[PDB]
JSON list of C-alpha atoms and ligand atoms in Angstrom, two decimals:
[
{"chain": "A", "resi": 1, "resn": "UNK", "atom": "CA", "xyz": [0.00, 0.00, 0.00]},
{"chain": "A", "resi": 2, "resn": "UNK", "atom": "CA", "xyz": [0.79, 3.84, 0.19]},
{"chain": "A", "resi": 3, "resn": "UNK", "atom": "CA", "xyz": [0.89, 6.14, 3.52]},
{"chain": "A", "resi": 4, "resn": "UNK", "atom": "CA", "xyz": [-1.67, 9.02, 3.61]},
{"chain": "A", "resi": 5, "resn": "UNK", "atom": "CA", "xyz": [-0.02, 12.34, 3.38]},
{"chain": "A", "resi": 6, "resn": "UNK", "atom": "CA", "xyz": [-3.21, 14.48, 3.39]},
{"chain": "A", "resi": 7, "resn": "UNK", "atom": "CA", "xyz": [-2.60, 17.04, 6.36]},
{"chain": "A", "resi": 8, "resn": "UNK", "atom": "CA", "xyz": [-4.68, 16.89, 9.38]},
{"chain": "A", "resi": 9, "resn": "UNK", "atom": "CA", "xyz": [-4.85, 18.93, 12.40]},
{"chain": "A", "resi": 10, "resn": "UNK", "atom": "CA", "xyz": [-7.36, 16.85, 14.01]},
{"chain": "A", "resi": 11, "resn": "UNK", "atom": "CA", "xyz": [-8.99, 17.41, 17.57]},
{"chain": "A", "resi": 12, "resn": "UNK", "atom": "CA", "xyz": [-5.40, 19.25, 18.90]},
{"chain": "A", "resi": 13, "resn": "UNK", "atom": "CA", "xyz": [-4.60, 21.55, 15.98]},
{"chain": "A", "resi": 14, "resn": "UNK", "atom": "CA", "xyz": [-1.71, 19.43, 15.49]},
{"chain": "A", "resi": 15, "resn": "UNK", "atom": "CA", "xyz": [1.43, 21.21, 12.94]},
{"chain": "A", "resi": 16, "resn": "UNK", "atom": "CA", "xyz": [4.99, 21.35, 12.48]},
{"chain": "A", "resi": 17, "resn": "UNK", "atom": "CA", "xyz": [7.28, 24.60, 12.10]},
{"chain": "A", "resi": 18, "resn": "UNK", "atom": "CA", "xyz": [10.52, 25.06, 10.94]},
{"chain": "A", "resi": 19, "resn": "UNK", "atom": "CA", "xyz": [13.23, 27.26, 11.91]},
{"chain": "A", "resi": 20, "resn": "UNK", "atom": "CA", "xyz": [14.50, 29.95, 9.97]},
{"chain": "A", "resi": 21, "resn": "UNK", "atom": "CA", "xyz": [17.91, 29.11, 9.01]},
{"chain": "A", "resi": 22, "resn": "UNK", "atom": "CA", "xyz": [18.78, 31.00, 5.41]},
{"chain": "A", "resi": 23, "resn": "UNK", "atom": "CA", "xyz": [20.16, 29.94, 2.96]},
{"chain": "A", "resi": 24, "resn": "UNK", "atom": "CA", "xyz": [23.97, 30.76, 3.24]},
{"chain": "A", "resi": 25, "resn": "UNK", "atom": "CA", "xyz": [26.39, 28.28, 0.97]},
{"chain": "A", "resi": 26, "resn": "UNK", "atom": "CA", "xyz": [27.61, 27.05, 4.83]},
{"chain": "A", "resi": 27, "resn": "UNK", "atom": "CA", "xyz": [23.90, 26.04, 6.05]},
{"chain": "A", "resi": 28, "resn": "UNK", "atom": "CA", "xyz": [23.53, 22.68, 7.22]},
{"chain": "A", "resi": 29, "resn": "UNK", "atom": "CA", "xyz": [19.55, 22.51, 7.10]},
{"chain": "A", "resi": 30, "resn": "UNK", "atom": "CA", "xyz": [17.00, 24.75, 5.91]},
{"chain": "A", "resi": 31, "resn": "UNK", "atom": "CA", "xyz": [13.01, 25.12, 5.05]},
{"chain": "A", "resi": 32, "resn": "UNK", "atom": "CA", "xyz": [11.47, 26.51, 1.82]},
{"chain": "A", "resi": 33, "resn": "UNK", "atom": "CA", "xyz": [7.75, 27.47, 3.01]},
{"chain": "A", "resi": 34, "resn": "UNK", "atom": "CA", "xyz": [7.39, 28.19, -1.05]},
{"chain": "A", "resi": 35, "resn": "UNK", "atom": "CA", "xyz": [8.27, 24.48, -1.63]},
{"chain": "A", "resi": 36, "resn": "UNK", "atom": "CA", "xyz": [7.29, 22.74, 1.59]},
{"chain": "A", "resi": 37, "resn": "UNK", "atom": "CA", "xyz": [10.77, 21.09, 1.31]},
{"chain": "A", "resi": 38, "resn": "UNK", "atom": "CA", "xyz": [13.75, 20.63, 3.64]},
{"chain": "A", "resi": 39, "resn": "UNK", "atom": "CA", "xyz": [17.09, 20.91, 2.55]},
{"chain": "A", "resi": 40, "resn": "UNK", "atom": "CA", "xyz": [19.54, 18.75, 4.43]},
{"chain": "A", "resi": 41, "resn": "UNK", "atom": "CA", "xyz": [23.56, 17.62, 4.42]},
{"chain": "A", "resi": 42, "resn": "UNK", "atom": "CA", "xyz": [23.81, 14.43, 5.32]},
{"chain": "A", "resi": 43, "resn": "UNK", "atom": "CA", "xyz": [23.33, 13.28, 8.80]},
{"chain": "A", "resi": 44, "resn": "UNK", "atom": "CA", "xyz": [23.14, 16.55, 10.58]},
{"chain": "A", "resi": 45, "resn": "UNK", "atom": "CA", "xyz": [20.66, 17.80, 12.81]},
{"chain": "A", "resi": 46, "resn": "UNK", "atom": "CA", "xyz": [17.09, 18.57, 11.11]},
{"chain": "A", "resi": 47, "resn": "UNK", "atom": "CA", "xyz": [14.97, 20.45, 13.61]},
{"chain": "A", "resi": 48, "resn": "UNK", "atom": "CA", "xyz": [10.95, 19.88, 13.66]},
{"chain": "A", "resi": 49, "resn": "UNK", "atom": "CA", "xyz": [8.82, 21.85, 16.15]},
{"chain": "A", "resi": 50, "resn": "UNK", "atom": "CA", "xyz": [5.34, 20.13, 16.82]},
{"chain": "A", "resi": 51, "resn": "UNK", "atom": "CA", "xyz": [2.44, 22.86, 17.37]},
{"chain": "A", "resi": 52, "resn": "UNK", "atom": "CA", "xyz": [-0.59, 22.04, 18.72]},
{"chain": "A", "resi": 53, "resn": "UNK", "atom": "CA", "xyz": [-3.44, 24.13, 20.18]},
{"chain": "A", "resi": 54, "resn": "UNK", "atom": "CA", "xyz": [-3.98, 21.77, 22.73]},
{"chain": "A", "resi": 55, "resn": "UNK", "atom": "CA", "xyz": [-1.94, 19.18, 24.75]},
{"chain": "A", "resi": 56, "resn": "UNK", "atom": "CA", "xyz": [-2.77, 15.69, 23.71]},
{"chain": "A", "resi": 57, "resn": "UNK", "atom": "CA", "xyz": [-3.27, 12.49, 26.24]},
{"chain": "A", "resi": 58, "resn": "UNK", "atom": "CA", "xyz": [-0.26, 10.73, 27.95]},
{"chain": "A", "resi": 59, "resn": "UNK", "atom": "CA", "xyz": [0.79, 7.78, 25.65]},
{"chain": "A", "resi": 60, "resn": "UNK", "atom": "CA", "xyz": [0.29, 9.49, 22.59]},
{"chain": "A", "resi": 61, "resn": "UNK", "atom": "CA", "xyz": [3.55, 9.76, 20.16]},
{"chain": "A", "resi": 62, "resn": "UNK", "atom": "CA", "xyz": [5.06, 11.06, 16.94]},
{"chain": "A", "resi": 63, "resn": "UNK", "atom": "CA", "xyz": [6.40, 8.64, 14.16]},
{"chain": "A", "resi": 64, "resn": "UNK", "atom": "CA", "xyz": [8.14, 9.82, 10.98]},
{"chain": "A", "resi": 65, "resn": "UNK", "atom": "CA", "xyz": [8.05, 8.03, 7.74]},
{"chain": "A", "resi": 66, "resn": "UNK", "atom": "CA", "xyz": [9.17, 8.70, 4.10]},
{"chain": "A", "resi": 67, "resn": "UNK", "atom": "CA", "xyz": [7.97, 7.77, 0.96]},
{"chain": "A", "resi": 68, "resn": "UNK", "atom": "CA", "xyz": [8.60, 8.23, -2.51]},
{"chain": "A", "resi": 69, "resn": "UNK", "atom": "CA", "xyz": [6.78, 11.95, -3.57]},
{"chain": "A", "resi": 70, "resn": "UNK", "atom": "CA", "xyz": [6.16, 10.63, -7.15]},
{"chain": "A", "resi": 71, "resn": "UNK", "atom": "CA", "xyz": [3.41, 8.30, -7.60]},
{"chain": "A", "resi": 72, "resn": "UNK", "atom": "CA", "xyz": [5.19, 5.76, -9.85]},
{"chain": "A", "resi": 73, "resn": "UNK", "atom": "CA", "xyz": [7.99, 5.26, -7.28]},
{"chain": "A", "resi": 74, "resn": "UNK", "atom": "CA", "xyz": [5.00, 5.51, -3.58]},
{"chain": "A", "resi": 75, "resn": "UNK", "atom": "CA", "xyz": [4.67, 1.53, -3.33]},
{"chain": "A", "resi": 76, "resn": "UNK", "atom": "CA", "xyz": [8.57, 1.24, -3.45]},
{"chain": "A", "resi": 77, "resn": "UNK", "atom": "CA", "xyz": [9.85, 0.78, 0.30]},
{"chain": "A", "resi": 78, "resn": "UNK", "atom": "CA", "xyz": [12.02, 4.32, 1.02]},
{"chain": "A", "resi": 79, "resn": "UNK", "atom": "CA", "xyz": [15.88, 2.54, 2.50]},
{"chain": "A", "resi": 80, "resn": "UNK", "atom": "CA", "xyz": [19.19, 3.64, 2.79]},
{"chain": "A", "resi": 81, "resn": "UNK", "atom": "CA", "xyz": [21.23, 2.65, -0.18]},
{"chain": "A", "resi": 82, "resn": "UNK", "atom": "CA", "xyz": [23.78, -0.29, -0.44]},
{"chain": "A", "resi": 83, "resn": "UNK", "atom": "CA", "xyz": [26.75, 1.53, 0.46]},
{"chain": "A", "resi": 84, "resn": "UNK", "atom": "CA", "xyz": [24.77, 3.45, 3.39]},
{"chain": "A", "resi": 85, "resn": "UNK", "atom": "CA", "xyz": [23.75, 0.29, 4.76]},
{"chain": "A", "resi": 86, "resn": "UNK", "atom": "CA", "xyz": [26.92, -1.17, 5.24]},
{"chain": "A", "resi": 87, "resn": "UNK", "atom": "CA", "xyz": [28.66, 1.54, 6.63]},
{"chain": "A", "resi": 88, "resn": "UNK", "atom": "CA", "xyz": [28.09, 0.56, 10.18]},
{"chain": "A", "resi": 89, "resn": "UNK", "atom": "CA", "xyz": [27.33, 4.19, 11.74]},
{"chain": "A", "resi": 90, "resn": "UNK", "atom": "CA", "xyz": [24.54, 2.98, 13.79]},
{"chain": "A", "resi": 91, "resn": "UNK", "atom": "CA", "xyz": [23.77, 5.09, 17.19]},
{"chain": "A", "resi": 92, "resn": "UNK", "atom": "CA", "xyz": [23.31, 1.67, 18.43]},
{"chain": "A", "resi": 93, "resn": "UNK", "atom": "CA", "xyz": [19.36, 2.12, 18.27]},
{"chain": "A", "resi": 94, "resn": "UNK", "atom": "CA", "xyz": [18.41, 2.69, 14.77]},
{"chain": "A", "resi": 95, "resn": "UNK", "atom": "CA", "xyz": [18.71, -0.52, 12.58]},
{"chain": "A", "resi": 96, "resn": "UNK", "atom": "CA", "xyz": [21.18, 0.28, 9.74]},
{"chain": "A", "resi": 97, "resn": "UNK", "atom": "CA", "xyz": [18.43, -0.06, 6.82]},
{"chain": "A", "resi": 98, "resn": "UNK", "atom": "CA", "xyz": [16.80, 3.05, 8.46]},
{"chain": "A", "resi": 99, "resn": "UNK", "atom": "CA", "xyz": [16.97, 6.39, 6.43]},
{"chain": "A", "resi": 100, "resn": "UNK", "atom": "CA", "xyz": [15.07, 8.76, 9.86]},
{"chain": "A", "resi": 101, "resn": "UNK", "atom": "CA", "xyz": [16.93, 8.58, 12.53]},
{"chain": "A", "resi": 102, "resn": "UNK", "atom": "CA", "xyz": [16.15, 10.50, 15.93]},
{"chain": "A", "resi": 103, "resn": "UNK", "atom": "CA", "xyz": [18.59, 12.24, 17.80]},
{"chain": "A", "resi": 104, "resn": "UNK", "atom": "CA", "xyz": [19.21, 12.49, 21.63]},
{"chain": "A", "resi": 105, "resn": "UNK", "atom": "CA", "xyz": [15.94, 10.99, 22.68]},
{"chain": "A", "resi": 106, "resn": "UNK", "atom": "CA", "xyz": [16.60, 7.19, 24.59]},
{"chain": "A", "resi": 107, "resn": "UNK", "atom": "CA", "xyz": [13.08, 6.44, 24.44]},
{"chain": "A", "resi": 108, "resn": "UNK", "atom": "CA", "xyz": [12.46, 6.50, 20.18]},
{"chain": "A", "resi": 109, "resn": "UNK", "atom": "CA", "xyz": [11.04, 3.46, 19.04]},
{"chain": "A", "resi": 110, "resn": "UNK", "atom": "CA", "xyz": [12.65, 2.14, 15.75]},
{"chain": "A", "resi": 111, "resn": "UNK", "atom": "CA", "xyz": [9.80, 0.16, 13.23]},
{"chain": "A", "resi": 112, "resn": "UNK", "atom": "CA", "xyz": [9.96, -2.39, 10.39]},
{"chain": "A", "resi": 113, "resn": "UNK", "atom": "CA", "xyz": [6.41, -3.12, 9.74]},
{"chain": "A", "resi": 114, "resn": "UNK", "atom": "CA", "xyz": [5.81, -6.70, 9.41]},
{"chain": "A", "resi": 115, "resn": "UNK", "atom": "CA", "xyz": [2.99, -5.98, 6.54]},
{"chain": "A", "resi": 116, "resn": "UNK", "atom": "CA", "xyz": [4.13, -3.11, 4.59]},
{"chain": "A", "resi": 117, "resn": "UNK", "atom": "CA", "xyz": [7.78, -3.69, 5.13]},
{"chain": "A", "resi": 118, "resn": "UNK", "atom": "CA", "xyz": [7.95, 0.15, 5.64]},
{"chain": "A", "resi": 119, "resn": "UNK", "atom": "CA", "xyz": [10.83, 1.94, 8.82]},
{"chain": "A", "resi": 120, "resn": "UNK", "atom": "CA", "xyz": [9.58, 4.71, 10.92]},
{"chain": "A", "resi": 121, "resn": "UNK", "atom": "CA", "xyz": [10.88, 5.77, 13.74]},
{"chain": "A", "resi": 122, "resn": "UNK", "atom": "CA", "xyz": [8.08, 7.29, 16.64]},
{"chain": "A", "resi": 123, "resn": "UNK", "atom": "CA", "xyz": [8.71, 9.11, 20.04]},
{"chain": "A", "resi": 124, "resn": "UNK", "atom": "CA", "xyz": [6.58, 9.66, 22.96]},
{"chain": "A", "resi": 125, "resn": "UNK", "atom": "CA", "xyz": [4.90, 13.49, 22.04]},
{"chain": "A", "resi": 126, "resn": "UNK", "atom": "CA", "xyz": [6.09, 15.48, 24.76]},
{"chain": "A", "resi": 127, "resn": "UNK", "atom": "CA", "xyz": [4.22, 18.83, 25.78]},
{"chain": "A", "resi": 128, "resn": "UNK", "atom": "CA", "xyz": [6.23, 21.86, 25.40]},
{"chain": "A", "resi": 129, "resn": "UNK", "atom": "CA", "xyz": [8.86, 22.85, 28.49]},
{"chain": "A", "resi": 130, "resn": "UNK", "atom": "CA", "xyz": [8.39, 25.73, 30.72]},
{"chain": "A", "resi": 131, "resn": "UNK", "atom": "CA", "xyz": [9.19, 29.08, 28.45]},
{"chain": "A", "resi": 132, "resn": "UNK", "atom": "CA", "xyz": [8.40, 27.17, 25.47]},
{"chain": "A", "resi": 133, "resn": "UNK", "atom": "CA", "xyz": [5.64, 27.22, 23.12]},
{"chain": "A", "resi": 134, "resn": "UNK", "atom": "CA", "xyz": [6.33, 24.07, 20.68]},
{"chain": "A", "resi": 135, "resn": "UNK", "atom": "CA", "xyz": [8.48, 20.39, 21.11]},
{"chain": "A", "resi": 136, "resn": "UNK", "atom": "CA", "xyz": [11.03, 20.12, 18.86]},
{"chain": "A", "resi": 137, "resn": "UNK", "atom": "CA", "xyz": [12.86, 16.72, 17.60]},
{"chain": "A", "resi": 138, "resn": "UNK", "atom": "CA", "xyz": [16.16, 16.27, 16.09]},
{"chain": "A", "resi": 139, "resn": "UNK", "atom": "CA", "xyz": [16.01, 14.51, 13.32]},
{"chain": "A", "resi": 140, "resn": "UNK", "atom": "CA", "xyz": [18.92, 13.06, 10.89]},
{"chain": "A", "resi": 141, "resn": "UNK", "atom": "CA", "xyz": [18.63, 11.41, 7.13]},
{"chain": "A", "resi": 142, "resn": "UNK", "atom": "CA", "xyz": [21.06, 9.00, 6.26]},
{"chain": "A", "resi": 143, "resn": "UNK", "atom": "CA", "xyz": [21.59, 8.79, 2.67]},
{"chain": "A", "resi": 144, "resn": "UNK", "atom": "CA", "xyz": [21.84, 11.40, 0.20]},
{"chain": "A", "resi": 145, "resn": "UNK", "atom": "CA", "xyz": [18.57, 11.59, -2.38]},
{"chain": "A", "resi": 146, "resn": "UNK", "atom": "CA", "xyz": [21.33, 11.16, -4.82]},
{"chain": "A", "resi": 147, "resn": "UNK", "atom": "CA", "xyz": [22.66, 8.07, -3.45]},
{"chain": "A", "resi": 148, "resn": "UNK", "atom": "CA", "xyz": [22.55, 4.97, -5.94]},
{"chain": "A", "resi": 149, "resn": "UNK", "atom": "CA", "xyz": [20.96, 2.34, -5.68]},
{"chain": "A", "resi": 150, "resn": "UNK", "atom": "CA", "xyz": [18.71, 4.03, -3.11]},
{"chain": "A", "resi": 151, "resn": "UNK", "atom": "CA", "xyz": [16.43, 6.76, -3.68]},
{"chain": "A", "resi": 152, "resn": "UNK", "atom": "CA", "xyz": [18.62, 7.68, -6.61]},
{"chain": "A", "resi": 153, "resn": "UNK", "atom": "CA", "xyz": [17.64, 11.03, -7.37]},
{"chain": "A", "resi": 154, "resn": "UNK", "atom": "CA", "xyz": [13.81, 10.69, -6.32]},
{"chain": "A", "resi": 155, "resn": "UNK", "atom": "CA", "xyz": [12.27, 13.02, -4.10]},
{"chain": "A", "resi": 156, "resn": "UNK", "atom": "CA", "xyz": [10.89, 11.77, -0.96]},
{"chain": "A", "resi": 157, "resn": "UNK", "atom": "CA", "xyz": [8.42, 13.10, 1.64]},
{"chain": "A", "resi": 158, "resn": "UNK", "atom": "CA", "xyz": [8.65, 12.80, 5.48]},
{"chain": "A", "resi": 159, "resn": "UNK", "atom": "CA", "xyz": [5.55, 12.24, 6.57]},
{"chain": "A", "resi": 160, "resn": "UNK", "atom": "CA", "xyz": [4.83, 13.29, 10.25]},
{"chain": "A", "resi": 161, "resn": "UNK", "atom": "CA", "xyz": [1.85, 11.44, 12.16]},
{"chain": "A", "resi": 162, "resn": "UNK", "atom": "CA", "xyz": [0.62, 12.34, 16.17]},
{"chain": "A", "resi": 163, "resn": "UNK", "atom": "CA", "xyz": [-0.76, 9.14, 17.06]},
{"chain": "A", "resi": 164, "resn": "UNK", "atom": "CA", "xyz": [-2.88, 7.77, 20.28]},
{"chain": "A", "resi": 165, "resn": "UNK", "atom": "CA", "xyz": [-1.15, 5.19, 22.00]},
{"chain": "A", "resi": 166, "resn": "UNK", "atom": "CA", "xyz": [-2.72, 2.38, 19.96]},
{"chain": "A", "resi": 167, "resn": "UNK", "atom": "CA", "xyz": [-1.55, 3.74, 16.83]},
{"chain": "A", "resi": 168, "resn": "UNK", "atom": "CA", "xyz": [-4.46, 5.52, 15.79]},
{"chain": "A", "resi": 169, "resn": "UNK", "atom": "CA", "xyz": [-4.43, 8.94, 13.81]},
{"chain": "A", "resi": 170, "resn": "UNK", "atom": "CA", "xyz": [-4.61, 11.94, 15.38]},
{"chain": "A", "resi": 171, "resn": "UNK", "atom": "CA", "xyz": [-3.19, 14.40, 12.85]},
{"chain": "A", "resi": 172, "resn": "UNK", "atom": "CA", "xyz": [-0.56, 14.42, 10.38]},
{"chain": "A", "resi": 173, "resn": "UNK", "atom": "CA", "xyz": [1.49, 16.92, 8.29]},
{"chain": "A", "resi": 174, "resn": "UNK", "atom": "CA", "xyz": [4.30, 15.99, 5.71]},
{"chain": "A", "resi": 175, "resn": "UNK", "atom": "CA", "xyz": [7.02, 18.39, 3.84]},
{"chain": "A", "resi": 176, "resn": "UNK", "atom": "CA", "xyz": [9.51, 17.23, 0.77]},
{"chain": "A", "resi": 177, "resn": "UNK", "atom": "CA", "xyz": [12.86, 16.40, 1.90]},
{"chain": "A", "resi": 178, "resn": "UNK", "atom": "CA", "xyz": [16.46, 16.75, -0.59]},
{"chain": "A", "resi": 179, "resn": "UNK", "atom": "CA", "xyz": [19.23, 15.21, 1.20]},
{"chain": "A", "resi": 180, "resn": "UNK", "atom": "CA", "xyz": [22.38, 17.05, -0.23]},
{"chain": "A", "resi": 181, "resn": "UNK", "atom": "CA", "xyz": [25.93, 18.15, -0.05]},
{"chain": "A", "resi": 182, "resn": "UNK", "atom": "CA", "xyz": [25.02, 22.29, -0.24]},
{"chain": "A", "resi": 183, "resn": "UNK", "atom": "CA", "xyz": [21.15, 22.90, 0.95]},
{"chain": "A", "resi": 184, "resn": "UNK", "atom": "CA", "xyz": [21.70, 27.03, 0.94]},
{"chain": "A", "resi": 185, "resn": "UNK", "atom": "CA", "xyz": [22.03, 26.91, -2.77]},
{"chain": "A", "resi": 186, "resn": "UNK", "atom": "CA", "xyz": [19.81, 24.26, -3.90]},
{"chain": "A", "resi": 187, "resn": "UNK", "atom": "CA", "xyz": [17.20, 25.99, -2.03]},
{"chain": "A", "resi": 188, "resn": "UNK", "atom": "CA", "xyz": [18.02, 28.93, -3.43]},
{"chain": "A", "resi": 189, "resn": "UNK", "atom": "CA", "xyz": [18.12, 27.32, -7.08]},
{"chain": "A", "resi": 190, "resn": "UNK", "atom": "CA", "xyz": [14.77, 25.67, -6.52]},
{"chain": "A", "resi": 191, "resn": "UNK", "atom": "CA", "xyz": [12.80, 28.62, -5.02]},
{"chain": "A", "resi": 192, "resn": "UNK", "atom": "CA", "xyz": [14.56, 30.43, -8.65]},
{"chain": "A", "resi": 193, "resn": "UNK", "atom": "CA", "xyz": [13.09, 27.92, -10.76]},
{"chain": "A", "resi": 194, "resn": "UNK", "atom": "CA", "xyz": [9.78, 28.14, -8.89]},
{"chain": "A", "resi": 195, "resn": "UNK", "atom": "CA", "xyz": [9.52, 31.84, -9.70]},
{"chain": "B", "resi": 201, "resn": "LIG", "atom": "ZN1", "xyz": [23.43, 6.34, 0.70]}
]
């Protein structure tokens, strides 16, 4: 099958926000709100704030998937490449296979569904600290988009799901990720050819 990406608040006006990091040659990570993508070098940090207008129950949690943004490639399972794979960089949590890794957070939960074959990776949803309006969590991606034999080129999505503690939906937003060597100028490049 294919993952819904259709954003949902739902019942806790559930969203994610991005910080505002330009788009010097030098950036590591940074958001295009023209292209709802993420620009990334590979395996740095990749902030995501969760919004909500409400605090959700105890139990629920946040998983992140990707999939393939074009429809002929959505049924194909999104993995780290051969080469990726093998490299042996695991945090000693994430399975190697995994392209979403968490950062700094003990408790994240690592998935290889036993139907779909699909890896996400899902945290307990945390409310927001004293002085602090949103949650954020670090994310990494471990392959480049241009890595062969992996997603080759293809653009992906990351697909961002609050769920009870069953599993069940409770809202969902997504954003297009490039995983790439200089994210300040292909976002600048993109956002050109957009205009
Ligand atoms: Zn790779």
């Amino acid at each position: 099958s294919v993952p819904s990406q259709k954003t949902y608040q739902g019942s806790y006006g559930f969203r994610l926000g991005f910080l505002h990091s330009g788009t010097a040659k030098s950036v590591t990570c940074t958001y295009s709100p023209a292209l709802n993508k993420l620009f990334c070098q590979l395996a740095k940090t990749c902030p995501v704030q969760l919004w909500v207008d409400s605090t959700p129950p105890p139990g629920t949690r946040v998983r992140a998937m990707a999939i393939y943004k074009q429809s002929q490639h959505m049924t194909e399972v999104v993995r780290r490449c051969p080469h990726h794979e093998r490299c042996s960089d695991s945090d000693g949590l994430a399975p190697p296979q995994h392209l979403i890794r968490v950062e700094g957070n003990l408790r994240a939960e690592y998935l290889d569904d036993r139907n779909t074959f699909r890896h996400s990776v899902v945290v307990p949803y945390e409310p927001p600290e004293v002085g602090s309006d949103c949650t954020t969590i670090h994310y990494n991606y471990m392959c480049y988009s241009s890595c062969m034999g992996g997603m080759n080129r293809r653009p992906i999505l990351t697909i961002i799901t609050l769920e009870d503690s069953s599993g069940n939906l409770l809202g969902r937003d997504s954003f297009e990720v490039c995983v790439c060597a200089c994210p300040g100028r292909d976002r600048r490049t993109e956002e050109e050819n957009l205009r």
